[PDB]
Amino acid sequence: SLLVPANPYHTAEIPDWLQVYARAPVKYDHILKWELFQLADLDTYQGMLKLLFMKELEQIVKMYEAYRQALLTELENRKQRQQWYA
Amino acid sequence: DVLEKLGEGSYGSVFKAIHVVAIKQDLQEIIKEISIMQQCDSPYVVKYYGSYFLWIVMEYCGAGSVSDIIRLRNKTLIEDEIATILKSTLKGLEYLHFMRKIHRNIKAGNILLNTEGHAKLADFGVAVIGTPFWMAPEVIQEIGYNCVADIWSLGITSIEMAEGKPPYADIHPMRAIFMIPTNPPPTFRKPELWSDDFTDFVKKCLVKNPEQRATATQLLQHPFIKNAKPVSILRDLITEAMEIKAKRHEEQQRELEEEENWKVPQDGDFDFLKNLSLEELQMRLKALDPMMEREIEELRQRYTAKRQPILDAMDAKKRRQ
Ligand SMILES: Nc1ncnc2c1ncn2[C@@H]1O[C@H](COP(=O)(O)OP(=O)(O)NP(=O)(O)O)[C@@H](O)[C@H]1O
Ligand SMILES: [Mg+2]
């Protein structure tokens, strides 16, 4: 059978200048010319941007899942607080 | 460069920019067209600078076109306002005809005003068939035509300023093509509202026969143009429009930073929910999803933008190989 390997970048450390390139503004984006890089080292960068987008998007969803539970928990307390009055 | 929107309503978007300027959105012919649009030096004509190798760069006029001002205030223009604009419009139309050019467009939308109120012509070298409300009969019939083809359009335009729409506006355009050459000259829908000077000026502009149609220079000596007031009378309507334009920009960004307080509290601390009214708690739960897809969308739209120049570069290299 065929075995596809886990993502190679989960273990490879991500250079800090590229995290700066992701936090950079919409404006300063073409500032960097990529033609000088080789075709293969450039593959090893766009993939780390996906991995960063994922770590960044996971944090977004978790925050909203927590805020969702916090809201639903408190709303259950206002409900139980109310019944206890009547 | 990159600044905000101005409109479209015709071809493509036109944008504002600082380098202040404005920009609009077979090649060797395009190049010589702008190259000749640059030779124009008149205070009654929008100045063209360059064309980014098509993206065009032109002078920025802060009050917009008289068309935008009519739509923003929801008011047509009175008679003194028209006469003042048309005088400045006719000058510079005289100028283009001096340089043996024909504007060929001309409509409330291509008459631009600076904040001082100076009207300036725009869009001459940037125009199976299109809308022919402002076109003269001979231009429609593809008979030959000369400089006074603009004068017909000027008459149609002055009706547009006075009533908010050109003649035949409500009709299907493809019907107008064949009604304009045949039917007699258009007139005002309520002639009694307008003076003898204005109606006669439009009567001299809308002569179906071009050889009996007034020229730019001749119309500069018309009573309707002589009683024209200084550019200072346009100051109030320019202030009205600029305030309406500004007030919706405030409503747009006040309603934008309003949605900012439905996003998740950044510190991750949700103990404060004890201080909210049940109704406020319901509202946040409800807004939760619409705001999460907003954050997520603005996340991918940023990352596919940071990630593309990398991909675009790998693509050129594979071709070279
Ligand atoms: N130099 C400029 N300064 C300010 N606003 C401008 C300028 N040029 C164009 N605009 C705006 O652009 C809007 C739309 O222009 P445009 O895309 O040319 O369509 P249009 O003028 O209505 N018809 P057309 O000129 O034939 O393409 C107008 O309503 C103006 O307010
Ligand atoms: Mg225009």
Side-chain angles (χ1 to χ4, degrees), chain B residues 24 109-110 112 122-123:
Chain B
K24 187 185 185 69
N110 295 330
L112 309 185
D123 295 342

Side-chain angles (χ1 to χ4, degrees), chain B residues 143-161:
Chain B
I143 306 168
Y145 63 87
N146 64 326
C147 57
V148 298
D150 292 338
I151 305 302
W152 177 282
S153 305
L154 192 69
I156 299 288
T157 304
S158 63
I159 298 171
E160 175 183 4
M161 297 185 193

Side-chain angles (χ1 to χ4, degrees), chain A residues 18 20-30 32 34-40 42-50 52-53 56-57 60-61 63-64 66-68 70-72 74-75 78-79 81-82, chain B residues 2 261-268 270-282 284-285 287-289 291-292 295-296 299-307 309-311 313-314 317-318 320-321:
Chain A
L18 197 56
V20 174
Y21 179 74
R23 296 176 183 179
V26 293
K27 304 171 77 173
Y28 311 146
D29 182 29
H30 307 104
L32 205 145
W34 309 84
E35 294 81 349
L36 282 69
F37 281 114
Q38 56 178 25
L39 188 149
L42 215 53
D43 185 86
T44 322
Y45 288 147
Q46 66 82 40
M48 316 178 100
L49 285 187
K50 283 197 191 173
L52 268 170
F53 169 87
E56 218 154 323
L57 175 127
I60 283 189
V61 166
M63 288 283 272
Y64 274 82
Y67 192 46
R68 182 184 303 280
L71 286 159
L72 289 170
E74 180 69 40
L75 279 163
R78 305 287 179 92
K79 185 181 181 178
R81 197 183 73 183
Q82 176 184 2
Chain B
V2 52
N261 298 274
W262 307 128
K263 301 188 177 181
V264 60
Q266 316 199 82
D267 57 21
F270 316 117
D271 191 50
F272 77 99
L273 299 169
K274 70 210 188 203
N275 301 325
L276 305 176
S277 64
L278 191 146
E279 296 80 354
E280 300 167 321
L281 293 167
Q282 297 166 341
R284 324 226 160 182
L285 190 68
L288 200 54
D289 297 283
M291 289 308 300
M292 194 192 72
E295 287 200 45
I296 291 174
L299 180 59
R300 73 153 289 275
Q301 92 182 353
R302 155 163 65 99
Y303 256 91
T304 66
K306 295 295 177 57
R307 188 188 149 217
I310 302 175
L311 295 170
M314 302 171 78
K317 292 180 185 61
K318 293 176 182 177
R320 295 173 189 179
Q321 293 175 351

Side-chain angles (χ1 to χ4, degrees), chain B residues 99-283:
Chain B
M99 294 202 65
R100 54 189 178 190
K101 272 185 280 200
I102 310 177
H103 191 296
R104 289 195 210 81
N105 233 339
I106 287 166
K107 58 217 278 186
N110 295 330
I111 299 177
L112 309 185
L113 290 167
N114 68 12
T115 304
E116 299 90 284
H118 293 344
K120 302 172 175 183
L121 300 180
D123 295 342
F124 14 110
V126 291
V128 183
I129 186 63
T131 167
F133 295 118
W134 295 264
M135 285 162 53
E138 69 274 19
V139 182
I140 293 170
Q141 290 174 266
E142 291 210 307
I143 306 168
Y145 63 87
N146 64 326
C147 57
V148 298
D150 292 338
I151 305 302
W152 177 282
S153 305
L154 192 69
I156 299 288
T157 304
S158 63
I159 298 171
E160 175 183 4
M161 297 185 193
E163 304 178 1
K165 288 191 309 182
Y168 304 152
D170 50 329
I171 295 182
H172 194 276
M174 303 312 303
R175 306 178 59 195
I177 287 171
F178 306 91
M179 294 170 58
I180 290 165
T182 60
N183 298 347
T187 46
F188 294 105
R189 292 159 85 161
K190 291 197 170 193
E192 76 271 7
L193 286 170
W194 315 109
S195 181
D196 305 333
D197 288 337
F198 187 27
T199 57
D200 182 73
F201 165 88
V202 179
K203 188 194 185 66
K204 283 173 170 52
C205 286
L206 303 179
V207 183
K208 293 184 73 184
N209 199 327
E211 76 194 315
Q212 297 298 107
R213 191 143 66 212
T215 66
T217 299
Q218 293 181 327
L219 289 173
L220 277 163
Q221 310 298 317
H222 192 279
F224 185 72
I225 299 294
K226 308 264 74 181
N227 190 66
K229 299 182 167 193
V231 79
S232 56
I233 68 164
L234 313 170
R235 285 192 56 79
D236 284 287
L237 72 89
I238 289 170
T239 303
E240 283 177 52
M242 284 182 69
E243 287 170 346
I244 297 160
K245 203 193 298 174
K247 186 179 173 180
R248 79 177 177 188
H249 179 27
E250 299 181 27
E251 293 172 40
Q252 278 173 13
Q253 262 192 38
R254 289 189 310 180
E255 297 162 5
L256 184 63
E257 311 293 6
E258 166 63 29
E259 296 178 349
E260 203 64 14
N261 298 274
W262 307 128
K263 301 188 177 181
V264 60
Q266 316 199 82
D267 57 21
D269 188 9
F270 316 117
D271 191 50
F272 77 99
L273 299 169
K274 70 210 188 203
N275 301 325
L276 305 176
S277 64
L278 191 146
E279 296 80 354
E280 300 167 321
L281 293 167
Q282 297 166 341
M283 180 175 292

